[PDB]
Enzyme design. Structure first.
Site, PDB file in Angstrom:
ATOM      1  N   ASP E 242       0.894  -1.152   0.000  1.00 36.12           N
ATOM      2  CA  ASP E 242       0.000   0.000   0.000  1.00 36.12           C
ATOM      3  C   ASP E 242       0.931   1.199   0.000  1.00 36.12           C
ATOM      4  O   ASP E 242       1.315   1.679   1.063  1.00 36.12           O
ATOM      5  CB  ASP E 242      -0.944   0.002   1.200  1.00 36.12           C
ATOM      6  CG  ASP E 242      -1.946   1.151   1.174  1.00 36.12           C
ATOM      7  OD1 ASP E 242      -1.959   1.951   0.218  1.00 36.12           O
ATOM      8  OD2 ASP E 242      -2.737   1.263   2.131  1.00 36.12           O
ATOM      9  N   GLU E 291      -1.097  -1.199  -4.115  1.00 36.07           N
ATOM     10  CA  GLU E 291      -2.265  -0.392  -3.801  1.00 36.07           C
ATOM     11  C   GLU E 291      -1.853   1.066  -3.794  1.00 36.07           C
ATOM     12  O   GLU E 291      -0.879   1.420  -3.122  1.00 36.07           O
ATOM     13  CB  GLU E 291      -2.846  -0.773  -2.442  1.00 36.07           C
ATOM     14  CG  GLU E 291      -3.793   0.248  -1.876  1.00 36.07           C
ATOM     15  CD  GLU E 291      -4.860  -0.377  -1.033  1.00 36.07           C
ATOM     16  OE1 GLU E 291      -4.578  -1.361  -0.323  1.00 36.07           O
ATOM     17  OE2 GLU E 291      -5.992   0.101  -1.105  1.00 36.07           O
ATOM     18  N   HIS E 371     -10.970  -2.230   5.847  1.00 36.35           N
ATOM     19  CA  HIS E 371     -11.208  -1.624   7.133  1.00 36.35           C
ATOM     20  C   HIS E 371     -10.685  -0.192   7.060  1.00 36.35           C
ATOM     21  O   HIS E 371     -10.043   0.227   6.100  1.00 36.35           O
ATOM     22  CB  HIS E 371     -10.468  -2.394   8.234  1.00 36.35           C
ATOM     23  CG  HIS E 371      -8.967  -2.404   8.103  1.00 36.35           C
ATOM     24  ND1 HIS E 371      -8.186  -1.399   8.622  1.00 36.35           N
ATOM     25  CD2 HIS E 371      -8.132  -3.128   7.335  1.00 36.35           C
ATOM     26  CE1 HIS E 371      -6.919  -1.634   8.334  1.00 36.35           C
ATOM     27  NE2 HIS E 371      -6.858  -2.698   7.564  1.00 36.35           N
TER      28      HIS E 371
HETATM   29 MG   LIG Z   1      -5.282   3.243   1.381  1.00 34.66          MG
END
Ligand SMILES: [Mg+2]
Ligand SMILES: [Mg+2]
Ligand SMILES: [Mg+2]
Ligand SMILES: [Mg+2]
Lengths: 49, 434, 104, 434, 434, 434, 145
Positions: E242, E291, E371
């Site tokens: 990420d 990501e 989440h």
């Molecule tokens: Mg993010």
């Protein structure tokens, strides 16, 4: 908010039951035992004096 | 209608990534209860021991499949057919079925999971709140939270021997206000630690473990956080300690060696010098609680500490009593401590937990319902604290849902109680004088 | 209303005629408004959220209301609107008037 | 289905032939609860007062039609619509509606009757025993009964100043055996009084009131009855006293004048002399409890009595505390007595009764649930004693059913509890040492 | 019987100690549902905003009393009366009642809480599992988890610009084995960091934030932890990133500045250089997911990255798509990314969440249920992932109950499904060739 | 749903401190009934005998463990499976199972307890009042009480041979008024005896046993109490006698030697002299009832007494008939007595009790439902008296719950009946002319 | 469930072909009771009198439409609401509603029909035999005919 639904409601006030000794019998003013008059009603007789 | 039809256990994870178990109980009418067990200890001289697999190829030997099989293949057949509202009968049957003093044959985790699941299923059947089922109609006291905010000892690498520093918002009108005060002091301490360049990432209980100079530095930073949040120390928020003196206690030298955590220049104190040190800390700071101030075997030291400080500061025995009724009775007879830390998994059942709580209450002691290092989303201990009207809880910091779930449950209980809800604060410390 | 309760047949009619899914909203003067301005007014406090909406209309002249029951000291069931009440009715008011020309 | 639909009240009679009231509560689904009120006192500065009609034409002014009308007209319209399980809310609503600190507007009898009826209707709705509803799942302790054996003071013409003498079978294994021992000692004492020419007729509480040669003769006869039944005084059965020193205390000279009940030759004692006399009685006989040993307004004398005898003998404050929260708090803070006599109609609400019980428990005091002199066939105080796990009860002697009903209820409770039931006996006197 | 009769919101805390709300829905027959809202963002042009009090006295302006009052006063009157199984009707009614594209009037948190509570109450009324109610009878697939294990970027002081590093146990046979592998790799990494002297405390998502030398150092330590647990990188466990490349993006110069996090000497990379760097990382390491590899406004960069790496690497748009149907449709039309991160509170309603998931699935994209930084004990996103058969979830690390609750719910779902339960693993990455 | 599922007996104390049993009956739907047996006699040639253990070490040989074992081990297995409303079938099945005319094998107490428990469980199942279930729809007549106000004979040390003196408030308008009059006369007599110097402590049935000079002195004091309460003797309140003439009848010389109780100066009377004495007492005082005025085996004396006084006063056969329809048949045939005292435990079942009441009614006799010396909190005899419209009850004095419970039940029945309730008073003596 | 909700009277025939009336009583849970009245005498010094029409065109003056209308329009509103097991209260309420010692206003036949119908409906609601409801548990003697 006070929507008129169909043709509306019937206005029925409460006043003490009275019976008239008309020369035909004893005529009660209303046909219910909960003392429900049709508010705003009257009768009249018109002559040509 | 209330006859137990199904008891089923499965293996889940706790808040530390280690396996625990959960037990589900189903009755005839469809009442449901789920109990999740906190992670305890598989070793102990006189404490209930949990059952671990010991398979080094699965979870590092911490699997709970043996206790799951014990619930599914032993406890379930014994318990199915019971009335779900027969909590005492079910717990007595499980204790007799285990047959050992420390619940080692079946595992204290298995028995505790079945007890919690049965109690919750019975509350579901009766359509009553869980605290109402557990403590009867007269359940109104919201416990005074003792929120851990700074870690030391073996939980941090800073030179602090004491294991936990906590804030006690005993000056709040309600529990909602006390929780808001605790959260604001938590965030103010976070800001202060960020300004000082200290670490902020939280530990097991959700509190910080910063690099402090010593115990006095940590207490003074906590006081600064309390004042930055806008609250008066010693009137609104107090300070509690968990020394855990058994970790730095020399058994054969009979000294409290602070050098294990505070460097070679630390103070190695005898029991008497430890009493004067604790009295100095109490006279210097607004300290209302000290937990494990003496070693678990220093009975004379505990009696001397209770004589010196037992009338103004709460003295809690965590490893001193290890929620054991025999130890608690001996400590009451010898006037050692004035409070016991109640851990439901260290005893095994809800019946014996409530028996220990009522024995402590009848002797003037305070029962503090406590969390464990490995917790779950289950928040039965909040219902236990409200149901017994214990008036005190120790369920961690303000930073992880393993701890925040209990605070949320206490908020729900207070909202449900409404006008009858009581928060007593300093009045919850009925073991103190004035 | 304690002497009466909502009838089960009317409740069922309101249930699967789905009249609660077609609510109308009104302001403080009782004028029909969209749900967005109703929410706006309730948030700003210019509308009372309690008495400011209607559950459409239930079709079919059903009685809205049934008598509510209670327990007597004998442990029997009894309607709430029946009982000792009172005792004051007189007889009537006979007003004579035996002269009115009654039209046929 | 749990909504309170009907609240009826009616006037009934008590055990003395004087009027009282009873309240029936019907919920929506038909759950039913009936609560009867024991006769109390309509006068008192700091106790809840009951409402009497004051009509000297009816029942000598002791009728309860006014409070029955208060329940039927005032309380019923406020309570109807509540949830039957909302006992705390209903009780708070009734207290607020009364609007008086001593509940003098509606009457304490009315409020207590509605409270008991609501609690019993809620227990009937939940299909659970009343002690289970009142105290939760952990209700197991059968109380140790201090049952009246001999009367004196104002209840007898004997030259004995002490109001009551009681037997406590604290050495019994179970409550069933304790009841059997009490009945057998009662019958043995009846035979002993018959063989001595004394009258064996019973009083209001079911105990004998014979004429003796003094307190020493009465205790000697009770010990002789205990031995004649086959039990060991001081190990099996103990002696309890109820001096009611407020009856023979002269406030002007601050002396306890035994000349009121023992004749012209009786001794007049001060506070120190009274404490010395109680100490000599304790050292001479197996006396385990003394009730109202000093006057209700003698706080210094009560403190001195607790300093001397309060370590080895139970000291029960009946008129000292009058089941008042403020008096109990003051006595706890001042170290006066170590037990409180709880009478449910002295406050008029189950919530406040349980609050007083927990407040006494948290201070190390014992709560003794007590009957009234005018009782009913209601046996709720037995369920109160079991629900709180008080461990001590005081419900009269072994004669009139106004006493036997509570013992039968405790027998029923023990039978339902089965293997779970606990009779602590001497261990229920936790306010003492060793 | 299924008609909603009560909607009630109360303000609770989240996993970080910041206020959020929870909603409870009660229907006529007693069916109950509770929905808790993860904390999101109150600011943003093209995403749903939450309603905060802004009162600096209470909780530092983060109170949720305004949105609680919006539920209790506005949403409650409209929703009470609907059938609880009318999820789409209730959601559309709430959207119309709000009237704004961003749900800023009522608050996205309020609408989402009511949506979740209504869905759970409908599932409770139907006596079916939540995933069965949401997704129908054909709910069998257990998501492959992307477990965050190392944090950098803004969540760590180390010279790493990538916000999160993750392990993906896609080689497991079942989800239970995948969870065991993730926990064992987590503990092996903890041991490695302890030996290395790096900090081991966890952050908001449960992962570590050590002080590595760079991205390569962190990835190599993750691979060492994978091999120390006994698993094969690139076959059993893969690595996800990420980047959160919008944080270190210099929009004015259209360049990616790694100097913000990786120090003054960090390399400066354009869009093509950033693509080359990501490709080099993919070739060197078993990276299966990247990501936010580009900025949320670099559409040409996203198109070039998907053209270069989209055939073998999952490219997820979190800030790129913001759970927006319009943004996702534009990305589908322009061949930007091949996956979308789905956050329920960024859209505000379960109906729109499922609409976005269906749109992503119909275009060959994978939907990853995610989440937020502040979570609750609510584990509805696990039921969302299983109900949609999404095949991937991102619910944090293996160390806090805000993350462990979702894994526990997935374990419960897998146990319920029994033989029907499926774990595709590498086959859940259907957006990738072969 | 009305099928008897459980029949369980337990041993409980009575009003005298002596054991007895209580039986609980549980049907399939949960209808519950409890029957408590009054303490009768285990001897008697033609009287149903209760079963006692005879273990002299337990309760002095008066334990009822054998009857409890008979109910739990013999009766319950035969009765379980019956319909709860089959009262006659259950009673005849129990009579056949016992097999003895006097019910000695199982004990009459066991049979009576099961009969009462079954009848009350059937009333609970039908949700009807117990008197409505027992007597049908036309149950309205509240019995006229004969309150035992003064004792004598074997219940007192005074020189009075007559066992009981009673007040009959036959002139009251309602039962509530009659009970109030009786209570006020009781208190007036209490005051009169207190100011005279005689005893006040109650006896077995609540009455007084003072040191009178004889029968005439006691009757005159009762008249003085009636007048001092403010009522008219002979118009409002009447006198009744229970001579217990079989106690001082010597069968050897066929005389009634009053010297047994009244000292050496008493008069020894033959049957004619006894009738003359009773007639002169009736002429002097307003005596309306004479119970057991002749020996139980003096049939010629009974016939002569009924010839002399049977037209104006009510002659009750207590020991004459022994609730035996055989002895009643004989007496009805030879015109001996005009009333029968009905003691439900002297016959053993409710079916035979109602058979005896109906046989007495068909002969013009009155049936007086009576208490026993050892009574309980059970108040079934009030429901029997109302259910049969007997119009007379003998349930003791106005000062012990064992007696007050039946008066309270009658007050409840009157309140429940409302305007339908009738109190015939003097009209309930339908066996007398005028 | 036990509360009288419907009281309906209709005119039927008797064993001699003369009219009489029957009353049907329905409670809330569906318990049903039907009471037929035997033909008696409408004249008597101190006996309850039945109410006949007197219309010599219909049934020779022996019609029972008046008593049927009295049950349908007077008794039914007064009785609906009562518990069906409140037999004594219902009978006393009907006696008071009539107001005359001979029950001549409403008619004795109307009151008897309502009484029998209420008792039968109460026995049907309790699911017990009618003799058990009327006389209690101790009903065993078969009459000598
Ligand atoms: Mg993010
Ligand atoms: Mg500790
Ligand atoms: Mg006293
Ligand atoms: Mg007799």
């Amino acid at each position: 908010k006070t929507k008129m639904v169909k043709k509306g409601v019937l206005k029925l006030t409460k006043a003490p039951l009275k019976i008239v000794k008309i020369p035909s019998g004893n005529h009660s003013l209303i046909k219910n035992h909960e003392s429900f008059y049709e508010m705003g009603k009257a009768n009249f007789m018109i002559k040509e004096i | 209608m209330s006859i137990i039809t199904d008891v089923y256990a499965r293996e889940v994870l706790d808040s530390r990534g280690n396996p625990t178990l959960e037990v589900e109980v189903y009755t005839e009418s469809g009442a449901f209860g789920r109990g999740m067990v906190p992670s305890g200890a598989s070793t102990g001289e006189h404490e209930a021991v949990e059952l671990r697999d010991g398979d080094k190829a699965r979870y590092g030997g911490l699997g709970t499949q043996k206790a799951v099989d014990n619930v599914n293949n032993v406890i379930a057949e014994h318990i199915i057919g019971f009335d779900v509202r027969d909590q005492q009968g079910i717990d007595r049957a499980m204790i007799a079925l285990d047959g050992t003093p420390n619940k080692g044959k079946l595992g204290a985790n298995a028995i505790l999971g079945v007890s919690i699941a049965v109690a919750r299923a019975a509350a579901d059947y009766l359509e009553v709140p869980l605290y109402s089922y557990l403590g009867g109609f007269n359940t109104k006291v919201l416990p005074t939270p003792m929120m851990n905010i700074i870690n030391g000892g073996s939980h941090s690498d800073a030179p602090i021997a004491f294991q936990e520093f906590m804030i006690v918002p005993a000056g709040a009108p309600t529990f909602k206000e006390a929780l808001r005060w605790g959260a604001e002091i938590f965030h103010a301490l976070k800001k202060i630690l960020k300004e000082r360049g200290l670490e902020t990432a939280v530990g097991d209980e959700g509190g910080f473990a910063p690099r402090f100079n010593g115990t006095e530095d940590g207490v003074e930073t906590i006081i600064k956080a309390i004042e930055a949040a806008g609250y008066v120390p010693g009137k609104d928020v107090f300070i509690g300690l968990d020394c855990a003196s058994s970790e730095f206690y020399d058994a054969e030298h009979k000294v409290y060696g602070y050098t294990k955590f505070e460097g070679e220049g630390a103070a190695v104190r005898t029991a008497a010098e430890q009493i004067d040190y604790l009295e100095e800390l109490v006279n210097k700071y607004p300290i209302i609680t000290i937990e494990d101030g003496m070693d678990e075997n220093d009975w004379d030291g505990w009696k001397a500490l209770t004589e010196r400080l037992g009338g103004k500061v709460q003295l809690v025995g965590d490893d001193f009593f290890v929620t054991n009724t025999a130890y608690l009775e001996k400590g009451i007879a010898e006037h050692a401590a004035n409070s016991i830390l109640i851990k439901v998994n260290q005893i095994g059942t809800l019946t014996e937990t409530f028996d220990a709580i009522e024995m402590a209450k009848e002797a003037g002691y305070t029962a503090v319902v406590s969390h464990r290092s490995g917790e779950t989303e289950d928040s039965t201990i909040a219902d236990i604290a409200v149901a017994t009207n214990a008036g005190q809880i120790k369920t961690g910091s303000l930073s992880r849902t393993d701890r925040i779930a209990k605070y949320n449950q206490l908020l729900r209980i207070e909202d449900q109680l409404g006008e009858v809800a009581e928060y007593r604060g300093l009045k919850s410390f009925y073991n103190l004088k004035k | 209303m304690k002497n009466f309760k909502i009838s089960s047949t009317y409740r069922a009619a309101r249930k699967q005629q789905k009249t609660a899914n077609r609510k109308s909203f009104y302001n403080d003067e009782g004028y029909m408004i969209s749900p967005s301005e109703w929410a706006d007014g309730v948030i700003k406090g210019l509308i009372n959220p309690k008495n400011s909406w209607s559950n459409d209309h239930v079709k079919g002249y059903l009685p809205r209301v049934s008598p509510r029951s209670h327990w007597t000291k004998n442990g029997y069931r009894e309607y709430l609107g029946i009982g000792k009440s009172r005792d004051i009715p007189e007889k009537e008011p006979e007003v004579i008037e035996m002269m009115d020309l009654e039209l046929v």
